[PDB]
Each structure stands twice: as structure tokens, then as C-alpha cells.
Amino acid sequence: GLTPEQIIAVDGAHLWHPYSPVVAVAAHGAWLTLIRDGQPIEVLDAMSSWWTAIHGHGHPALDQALTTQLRVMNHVMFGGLTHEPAARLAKLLVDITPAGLDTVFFSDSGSVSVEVAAKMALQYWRGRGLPGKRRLMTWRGGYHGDTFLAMSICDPHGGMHSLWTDVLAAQVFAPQVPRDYDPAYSAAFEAQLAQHAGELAAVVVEPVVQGAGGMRFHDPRYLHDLRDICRRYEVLLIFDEIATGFGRTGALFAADHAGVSPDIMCVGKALTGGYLSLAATLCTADVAHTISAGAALMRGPTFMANPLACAVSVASVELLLGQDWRTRITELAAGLTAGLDTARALPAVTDVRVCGAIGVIECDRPVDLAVATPAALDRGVWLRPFRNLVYAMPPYICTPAEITQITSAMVEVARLVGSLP
Amino acid sequence: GGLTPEQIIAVDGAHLWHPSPVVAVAAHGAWLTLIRDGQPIEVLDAMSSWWTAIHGHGHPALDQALTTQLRVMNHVMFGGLTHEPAARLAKLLVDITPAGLDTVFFSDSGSVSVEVAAKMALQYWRGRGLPGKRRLMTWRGGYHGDTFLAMSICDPHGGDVLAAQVFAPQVPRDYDPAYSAAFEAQLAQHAGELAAVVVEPVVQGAGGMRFHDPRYLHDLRDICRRYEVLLIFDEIATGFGRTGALFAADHAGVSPDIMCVGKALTGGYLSLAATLCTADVAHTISAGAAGALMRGPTFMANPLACAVSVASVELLLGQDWRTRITELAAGLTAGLDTARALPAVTDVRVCGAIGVIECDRPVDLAVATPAALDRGVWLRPFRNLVYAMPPYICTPAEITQITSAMVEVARLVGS
Ligand SMILES: Nc1ncnc2c1ncn2[C@@H]1O[C@H](C[C@@H](N)CC[C@H](N)C(=O)O)[C@@H](O)[C@H]1O
Numbered sequence: 042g043l044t045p046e047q048i049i050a051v052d053g054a055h056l057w058h059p060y061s062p063v064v065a066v067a068a069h070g071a072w073l074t075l076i077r078d079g080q081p082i083e084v085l086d087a088m089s090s091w092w093t094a095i096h097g098h099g100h101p102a103l104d105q106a107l108t109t110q111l112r113v114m115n116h117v118m119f120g121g122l123t124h125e126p127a128a129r130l131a132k133l134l135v136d137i138t139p140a141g142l143d144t145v146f147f148s149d150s151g152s153v154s155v156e157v158a159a160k161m162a163l164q165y166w167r168g169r170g171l172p173g174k175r176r177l178m179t180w181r182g183g184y185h186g187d188t189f190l191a192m193s194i195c196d197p198h199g200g201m202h203s204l205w206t207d208v209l210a211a212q213v214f215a216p217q218v219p220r221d222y223d224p225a226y227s228a229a230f231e232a233q234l235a236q237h238a239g240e241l242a243a244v245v246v247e248p249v250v251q252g253a254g255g256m257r258f259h260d261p262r263y264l265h266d267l268r269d270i271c272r273r274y275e276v277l278l279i280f281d282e283i284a285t286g287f288g289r290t291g292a293l294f295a296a297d298h299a300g301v302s303p304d305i306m307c308v309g310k311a312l313t314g315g316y317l318s319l320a321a322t323l324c325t326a327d328v329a330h331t332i333s334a335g336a337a338l339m340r341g342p343t344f345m346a347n348p349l350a351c352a353v354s355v356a357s358v359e360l361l362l363g364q365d366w367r368t369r370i371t372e373l374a375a376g377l378t379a380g381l382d383t384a385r386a387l388p389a390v391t392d393v394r395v396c397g398a399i400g401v402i403e404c405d406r407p408v409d410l411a412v413a414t415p416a417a418l419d420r421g422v423w424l425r426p427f428r429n430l431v432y433a434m435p436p437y438i439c440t441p442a443e444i445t446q447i448t449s450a451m452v453e454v455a456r457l458v459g460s461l462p
Numbered sequence: 463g464g465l466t467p468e469q470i471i472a473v474d475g476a477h478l479w480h481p482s483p484v485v486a487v488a489a490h491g492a493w494l495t496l497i498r499d500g501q502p503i504e505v506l507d508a509m510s511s512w513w514t515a516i517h518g519h520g521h522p523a524l525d526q527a528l529t530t531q532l533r534v535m536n537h538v539m540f541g542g543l544t545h546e547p548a549a550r551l552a553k554l555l556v557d558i559t560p561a562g563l564d565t566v567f568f569s570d571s572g573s574v575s576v577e578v579a580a581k582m583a584l585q586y587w588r589g590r591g592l593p594g595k596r597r598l599m600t601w602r603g604g605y606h607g608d609t610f611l612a613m614s615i616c617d618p619h620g621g622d623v624l625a626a627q628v629f630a631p632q633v634p635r636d637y638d639p640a641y642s643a644a645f646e647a648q649l650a651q652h653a654g655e656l657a658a659v660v661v662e663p664v665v666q667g668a669g670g671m672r673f674h675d676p677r678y679l680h681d682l683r684d685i686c687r688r689y690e691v692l693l694i695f696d697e698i699a700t701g702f703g704r705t706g707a708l709f710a711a712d713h714a715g716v717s718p719d720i721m722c723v724g725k726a727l728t729g730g731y732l733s734l735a736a737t738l739c740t741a742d743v744a745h746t747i748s749a750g751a752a753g754a755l756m757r758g759p760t761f762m763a764n765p766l767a768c769a770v771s772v773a774s775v776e777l778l779l780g781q782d783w784r785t786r787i788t789e790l791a792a793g794l795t796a797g798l799d800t801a802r803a804l805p806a807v808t809d810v811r812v813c814g815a816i817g818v819i820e821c822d823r824p825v826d827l828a829v830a831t832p833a834a835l836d837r838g839v840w841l842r843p844f845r846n847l848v849y850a851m852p853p854y855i856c857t858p859a860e861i862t863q864i865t866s867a868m869v870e871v872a873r874l875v876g877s
């Protein structure tokens with residue numbers, strides 16, 4: 042039962058974080074209880090805890106789903122055994138994802154689901170007698186995880202491939218996909234892919250929204266082009282929807298904006314409503330059959346299809362489906378847009394953009410976290426900028442007033458960027 | 463929306479990838495409730511659910527730790543925030559692991575914790591101004607996970623194509639200082655290219671359930687120190703008492719520079735792993751250029767998983783675990799002894815709460831599985847191995863039942 046000061050002391054001495062942290066002591070609905078100057082303060086989780094908390098924290102339905110599962114069985118090995126939570130979740134996922142995806146492979150994290158997607162693609166072509174088809178192609182600006190293979194398709198400059206390469210698989214990169222639709226971009230993409238088609242297993246991209254590579258949006262029409270290009274050159278298409286899934290862009294999955302189905306698909310983050318790590322890789326029947334007809338995909342992972350994480354996800358997915366989630370996301374998008382409009386006129390702001398429940402203020406310099414953090418906290422909001430971006434991905438349960446409280450703090454952070462000393 | 467066992471099977475058959483499965487409907491203590499010919503039957507979890515359920519399933523103390531935490535905070539992002547379950551767990555881990563390991567990096571799986579270890583080692587030598595130290599060295603027979611980097615040090619045969627590391631021969635069971643000398647000679651040839659030696663200490667698990675004399679770890683520690691190569695121990699399988707020491711490293715009295723834990727860390731409730739390093743590794747990386755070891759992972763240091771793990775570790779430490787494992791080891795030895803005289807049995811071996819019958823041919827799972835279930839035991843052999851890694855809470859009578867089923871499966875492989 043440590044005190045905030047003891048927590049801070051232990052953390053300073055023994056904990057590695059990604060990249061002095063604030064002590065969080067509670068989380069309920071859209072709100073976190075954080076320790077500031079030795080006192081608890083309530084702040085909005087404008088980040089959704091890294092895009093996971095779509096229904097808020099401590100939602101009664103998700104809490105209960107977990108406690109109910111905990112009562113009957115915490116976990117059994119998925120080697121030789123199956124269970125209801127995996128079965129229910131698999132059925133839900135195949136039903137709500139783009140058409141053709143009827144096979145589900147569970148893992149424990151988004152990056153591992155991407156590795157699984159890559160193994161599927163490589164084993165697919167090997168089972169066709171084409172093992173030379175082993176490279177991946179993507180466009181720049183992407184992010185697909187922190188493992189070595191996932192790093193090989195992350196943006197090469199944002200990912201510092203230069204001090205990670207000769208250790209990274211050498212992949213094929215098209216230029217940054219532009220925001221607005223330009224048929225010349227897709228034509229150049231096809232021409233590059235065509236040169237490598239015989240060594241390419243798959244194209245892998247984040248559809249519509251590129252998250253951790255810079256919160257960039259692109260016209261859904263580009264996905265239509267990639268689908269067609271991949272089909273003609275016999276290259277699989279992989280959509281990484283670990284960030285875009287479960288309504289976040291205003292459609293259930295961002296692929297839906299283009300009306301295209303990839304051959305393989307990854308989901309994670311919002312999958313469990315931000316309770317527990319879980320991810321999934323889906324593929325088509327043709328992909329699954331070719332692999333399984335081939336000469337023997339994974340030995341684990343150990344916690345594959347964990348009943349607890351699967352049960353809460355079922356509850357989270359059913360909670361989303363059982364409400365008018367589309368209207369809800371449309372309203373949040375409208376709130377973000379109206380709330381961020383004022384930021385456009387600010388001196389250090391280069392762009393303001395919104396896609397579904399994603400709100401972005403792009404600035405003309407890197408955001409100084411030692412300035413941004415306390416300023417947002419002074420305004421009752423937890424914001425975590427990265428690079429030159431002040432952005433939010435709020436819980437879907439945020440009220441119109443909470444949304445404007447978030448956007449108001451974002452504008453205020455940008456203003457300080459901003460000016461200055 | 464509330465499935466019958468027949469419906470679970472139909473849904474699984476149509477839409478689930480596994481690594482025809484048996485439907486599990488419950489688990490409590492050392493027992494699983496499985497569906498066999500329509501009927502819910504209880505069987506022993508002789509595998510501890512892939513080596514994770516050390517206190518058994520649904521342990522009141524661990525269940526309670528989870529229900530307590532859920533009421534307060536399910537999860538927050540570990541980017542810019544910290545919390546009590548993370549602090550409590552990092553503190554326990556630093557205290558109970560080999561001396562010198564004082565920094566903890568949490569992740570969601572063992573295979574990821576191994577990639578994190580590799581990233582620490584690579585960034586370490588860059589921070590020392592030695593960026594040519596980039597390759598890994600291991601010995602044959604190992605397993606480190608299913609991710610791409612992790613697979614690069616898994617046993618080459620059995621598991622560009624695709625990250626070419628340095629491999630010493632299979633480490634022998636008995637101690638032969640000549641093995642260690644040849645290991646040193648090979649390492650010396652590559653020392654300037656090598657970031658780290660990575661091995662499983664004492665027990666190699668998914669690569670063949672092979673044991674080796676702890677003195678080899680002693681030698682590796684000295685070899686590594688003399689040649690400026692980091693030593694990494696992957697204790698994802700061996701951790702938390704499984705081999706009769708708290709950590710397998712303890713059988714040799716050595717500390718690695720970096721260490722990985724997972725599996726039994728949470729008592730098998732939830733996926734969590736961790737990578738620990740020394741203060742010299744942490745400071746040398748953090749004073750180094752890039753920043754960004756990870757972004758990464760989204761669910762890093764999950765309050766729920768950390769909380770249950772605290773309860774699990776405290777449960778283990780709060781008892782005479784050492785005596786418990788000794789009793790388990792003794793029970794496994796007595797129960798498997800019989801099997802050595804069987805036509806198909808090459809070896810019988812026990813190390814802590816790990817019991818192994820090695821056969822002269824593959825075990826048929828279509829024969830082995832139903833045979834042990836009829837005996838009230840869930841056993842999953844692999845390759846030529848019939849083995850168990852049972853919960854620590856298994857009674858002598860449960861151990862005899864497990865070992866009896868094991869001998870019978872071995873007796874059948876020969877038939
Ligand atoms: N001043 C800064 N400069 C660079 N990066 C920063 C800064 N402040 C924050 N960030 C952190 O960098 C992290 C990078 C994130 N976009 C990671 C994305 C994603 N949620 C993931 O973890 O996979 C953000 O979560 C921020 O917390």
C-alpha cells in the first residue's frame with residue numbers, strides 16, 4: 042500500500058519507461074486520479090491510455106465480464122485445449138471484420154500480431170512453391186510495433202533504421218502516402234512493387250490513419266488501389282488496424298471507408314477496452330488452407346487466447362456493437378472539430394485535423410513535454426504529445442462538455458508552444 | 463453469447479488457429495474441468511498450463527489481488543505515468559533476482575522480453591562506442607520465443623532466411639571443462655562482433671527438456687567478463703522456484719548482465735514478462751544517444767497483471783518453497799523411476815518440479831492424450847518427450863497419479 046512518494050522513489054530507482062512520471066492512483070470512466078504536488082487531482086484521459094480505453098476505465102460491464110470469467114477459469118494452455126471466451130471472441134471478430142477474414146490467431150500484443158501476420162504471408166507463398174517471396178513492402182510514415190521484424194516496416198527515419206540496420210530485415214519502402222488522393226502516387230507505387238513482385242510476400246500498411254508515425258490521414262481511395270495492385274501482381278495485402286480498429290476512425294474498421302478487404306489483418310489496443318493486453322491476426326480461408334496444406338506457424342505464445350483477456354474483449358466488443366457507435370463517433374468528431382478550430386490561427390500551429398475520434402494539432406516545432414504536461418494538467422486533462430503533435434483519442438464515453446474540456450486544453454498547450462519563453 | 467461445448471468446437475473448428483482440441487470449461491487448483499464424451503471431467507494440469515500455473519488456478523490470494531486492483535484502476539499508459547503495482551513488482555523482482563539486476567523493463571510476453579534484452583545489449587555497446595558488437599551467441603538446443611529475433615537463437619534445426627547468429631554445440635548434461643574451453647575459443651573468434659551470449663540456465667525447455675551442469679554458467683560468466691561480451695539468462699521457463707532454486711542462475715551463483723522472466727511471473731493468470739538489467743547496462747544505454755529502446759508496448763506494466771504477479775511472487779516467498787520443490791522433485795523421481803526399464807525409454811530425468819521421460823521415437827499425441835485423460839491427467843508430450851511441470855500445490859497423491867499416467871504413456875509408445 043505504498044505512498045505516492047514511495048512509488049516515485051521505487052520508480053526512479055528501478056523502473057524503465059518507454060522513451061519524472063506522474064503517479065496514477067485511480068481510474069474511473071473517462072477520468073484518472075493523479076498525484077500533483079502531493080495532492081490527488083482528477084484529469085480526463087484524453088489519450089484513452091494510448092488509444093485503448095474506448096469505454097472508459099472501470100466500466101461495470103467489462104469489470105463484471107472479467108470477474109465472472111475469473112470465477113470459472115483464469116487460463117489454460119491453447120495447445121490441445123479450447124474454451125468459450127476464445128470461441129465467442131473469434132466468432133465476433135470474424136463477423137465484424139471486412140469480408141473474407143474467417144480465421145483468427147490470438148497473441149498477446151500488437152507487435153506480435155504483426156509478426157504473426159508476416160509469418161502467415163511468408164508461409165503462404167512457401168506453400169505455393171514460391172519461398173523467394175519473403176520481403177515486405179510498405180509506404181513511409183508507418184508504425185507496426187517494437188519487435189525487430191515490426192521495426193523493419195516502421196518508418197526508417199522516425200524509427201532510426203540507420204542505427205538498427207544490418208540488424209533489420211531490408212524491406213521495400215514507397216514514399217509517404219499524401220493526404221489528398223493523387224493517382225500518380227498509386228501509379229508510382231505499382232511501378233515500384235512490380236520491380237520487386239517476385240521477392241515480395243506482402244504489402245503492409247495502416248489504413249486511412251497512420252498513428253505513431255505522425256498521425257497522418259490519407260484518402261481511403263489509396264486502399265482501393267493497393268487492393269487492386271496486390272491482386273494483379275500476386276502480393277498479399279496486410280492491414281494493420283491495431284490503432285484504427287473498433288470505431289476509432291468513424292467506421293468499425295478503417296478498411297470500411299474504402300470498402301476493401303485485406304488478405305490478413307491485425308487488431309489490438311482497443312480490443313479489450315484497455316483492460317488487458319491482447320491482439321489478433323485474421324486471415325482468409327485461402328491463406329489458412331494454403332499454409333495448413335503446406336509443409337509445416339508458432340509454438341506459442343504461452344498465453345495465447347487467454348480466457349480473462351478474451352472474456353473482457355467479448356464484453357468490450359458487444360458493448361460497442363450494442364449501441365449506436367456510429368452516431369457516437371460522429372458526435373465526438375464534431376466536438377473535436379469545433380473545439381480545435383481556434384488552434385488554426387495560432388502562430389506555432391501548421392495544421393489542425395480530425396478523423397473520427399482522433400483530433401490533431403500539428404505544430405511547427407517539437408512539443409516540449411516539460412511545458413505541455415503541467416499546462417494540460419493545470420487544465421484538468423492528461424495529454425501526451427509526441428514529436429510536433431498535440432493530439433487526442435478520447436474515450437467514446439466522453440460527454441460533449443468533456444470533449445470541449447479536452448480540446449480547450451489542447452489549444453492552450455499549442456498556444457504555449459507557441460509563445461514561448 | 464453463452465456457448466455449449468459442441469458449439470465451442472464448431473466455432474473453434476471453423477475460425478480458430480491453434481499452435482481437434484478438447485473443450486475446457488473450468489480450472490481450479492491443480493485441476494482442469496475438461497469435456498470428454500459430452501461430460502465435464504476433472505483432470506490434473508500436469509503441465510501447469512505451459513509452465514505458468516505454479517500456485518494452481520483460481521488461487522484465492524491471486525484472484526483477490528486482481529479483484530482488489532480492478533476496483534481501483536484497470537490500466538493506465540506507462541508513458542509519463544507510474545503506479546503502485548508496477549513499483550511493488552519492480553521492487554520485488556530487483557530483490558529476489560541474482561544480485562546486481564536493479565532495473566526492470568516490463569513487456570507483455572516472453573518473446574518480447576527477449577527482444578528487449580537484445581535491444582539493451584545492442585544499445586549498450588553503441589553507448590560504449592562499439593557499434594560493431596551486434597551479434598548474439600548461444601548454444602544449441604535452446605528456445606527463446608517465436609518472434610523473428612528470438613527465433614534467431616532458437617535451436618537452428620527443428621524450429622535472407624533470417625538473422626545469422628553464432629552457435630556453440632549442444633551443452634552436455636555432465637560437466638566437462640573441455641566444453642567450456644571450446645566455447646571460449648569460438649567466442650574469442652567473434653568477440654568484436656558479439657553483443658551478448660544468451661542462454662537458458664540449467665534447463666533448456668522447449669528445445670528438448672535438457673539439463674546441464676550449473677558450472678557451465680559459472681564458466682560462461684567468466685568467459686563473458688574476460689572478453690567483454692554481455693551475459694543474458696532467459697529464465698522465462700526456469701524462474702520462480704521451478705528448478706529448485708528461486709532462479710536457475712542461483713544453482714551456479716552467477717548474475718547475468720540481463721535477465722528475462724515471464725510465464726509463472728503472474729501465477730499463470732495473465733500475460734506479463736520483464737527484462738532486468740544491471741545499473742551499468744542501464745546507465746550506459748541511457749547516457750547513450752538515440753533514446754527509444756521501445757515505444758512501446760502499449761500495455762506495458764499493466765496494473766492488473768502486475769498486481770496478480772505481486773500476489774504470486776509474495777505467495778511463493780511467504781512459504782518454504784524450497785522444501786516444497788524438493789518434495790515435488792522426490793515425488794517425481796520415485797514415480798518415474800519405473801519407466802527407465804521400458805523398451806522405448808532412453809532416459810528418465812528430474813530437476814526440481816520438472817520430470818522427464820525421453821523416448822527413442824516421437825510420441826503419438828493421438829495416442830498419448832486420450833491415454834492420460836482416461837487416467838485423470840492432462841499431459842502434452844512434444845517430440846520424443848513425456849514430461850510434467852506440475853503446480854507447486856500438487857499433493858504426493860496427485861504427483862503419483864501424474865507420474866503413473868506418464869509411465870503408462872511411455873509404456874504405450876513402445877507397444
Ligand atoms: N517531447 C516529446 N518528444 C518526442 N516524443 C514524445 C514527447 N512527449 C511524448 N512523447 C511520447 O512519445 C510517445 C510515442 C507514442 N506516440 C507511442 C504511440 C503508441 N501509443 C505506442 O506506444 O505504440 C507518446 O506516447 C508520448 O507519450
Ligand SMILES: *Cc1c(COP(=O)(O)O)cnc(C)c1O
Pocket residue numbers: 149150151152153155184185186187247252253281282283284285309310758759760761
Ligand atoms: C500500437 C501499434 C502496434 C503495436 O502494438 P503493441 O501492443 O504496443 O505491441 C502495431 N501497429 C499499430 C498500427 C499500432 O498503433
Ligand SMILES: *Cc1c(COP(=O)(O)O)cnc(C)c1O
Pocket residue numbers: 341342343344570571572573574576605606607608662667668696697698699700724725
Ligand atoms: C516460454 C519461453 C519463451 C517465450 O515466451 P512467450 O510468452 O511464449 O512468448 C521465451 N523463452 C523461454 C526460455 C521460454 O520457455
